[PDB]
Amino acid sequence: FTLIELMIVIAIVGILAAVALPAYQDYTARAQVSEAILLAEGQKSAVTEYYLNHGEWPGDNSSAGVATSADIKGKYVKEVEVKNGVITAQMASSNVNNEIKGKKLSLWAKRQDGSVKWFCGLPVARDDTDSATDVKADTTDNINTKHLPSTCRDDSSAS
Ligand SMILES: *[C@@H]1O[C@H](C)[C@@H](NC(=O)[C@H](O)CO)[C@H](O)[C@H]1NC(C)=O
Ligand SMILES: *OP(=O)(O)OC[C@H](O)CO
């Protein structure tokens, strides 16, 4: 070889040293959001029991029989709230991935003639406590669909 080959080798080493990386931030965000999903999954029992025994959805945390919103906290979850039958979880503002800072996701259920189905995805709000009221969509501090698992990507019109 000659000096040209050595210079080419050095240039190739420099090229390999600085290369672009894929978006692992989305994967880390999904891993962190899984914790909030698990935390919100544990409040289904009280809501279901209240609906079955009273015939209408619970109004707030106190009526359902769970702790206050500011007390249901985890490593990456700030608060979990129940309002008219929907469970919304809000992330924290520090020591959390930048893409899911201050975002929310919601869980809600619909009653059928022989089963009760549960949905998970973007934030959703209900108007009153009636058992047949539909669910609208909320557009305040909404999480992005790229930070959620493929299973938890439901819409407000799902039935
Ligand atoms: C239990 O949840 C109920 C929906 C709520 N009731 C009402 O808001 C209306 O009275 C329904 O006609 C209760 O206030 C809740 N109980 C509490 C907060 O202790
Ligand atoms: O936890 P809670 O349902 O009391 O709500 C906390 C929040 O500050 C009120 O929106």
Author numbering: 1 to 159
Copy text verbatim from the article accompanying this structure deposition.
The structure of pili purified from the 8013 strain expressing the SA sequence type was determined in the same fashion to shed light on the impact of sequence variation on the pilus structure (center). Pilin expressing the SA and SB sequence types have the same PTMs but they differ in their amino acid sequences. Comparison of pili from strains expressing pilin of SA and SB sequence types reveals nearly identical backbone structures except in the C-terminal hypervariable loop. In this region, the SB structure shows a longer and more protrusive extension, mainly due to aminoacidic deletions in SA. Accordingly, molecular dynamics analysis of the SA pilin shows limited movement in the hypervariable region compared to the SB sequence type. Since mutations of charged amino acids in this area of the SB sequence caused loss of bacterial aggregation, the global change of shape of this loop between the SA and SB sequence types is likely to affect the basis for pilus-pilus adhesion. Interestingly, although the backbone structure is identical, several side chains in the first strand of the beta sheet, close to the alpha-beta loop, are also different between sequence types. Recombination-based amino acid changes had a strong impact on nanobody binding and neither F10 or C24 showed any binding to SA sequence type pili. Structures reveal that clashes come from amino acid differences located in beta sheet strand 1.
Typically, the type IV pili are helical polymers constituted of one protein component, the major pilin. Type IV pili not only serve as multifunctional organelles allowing the adherence to host cells and the auto-aggregation of these bacteria, but also play an essential role in their pathogeneses. Molecular dynamics of the whole pilus with GATDH and G3P for a period of 1µs showed the overall stability of the structure. As previously described, the PilE monomer contains a 4 strand beta-sheet region, and an N-terminal melted alpha helix that forms the core of the type-IV pilus. Immune evasion against antibodies targeting type IV pili is thus attributed to the structural diversity present among strains, including variations in pilin sequence, sugar type, and phosphoform.
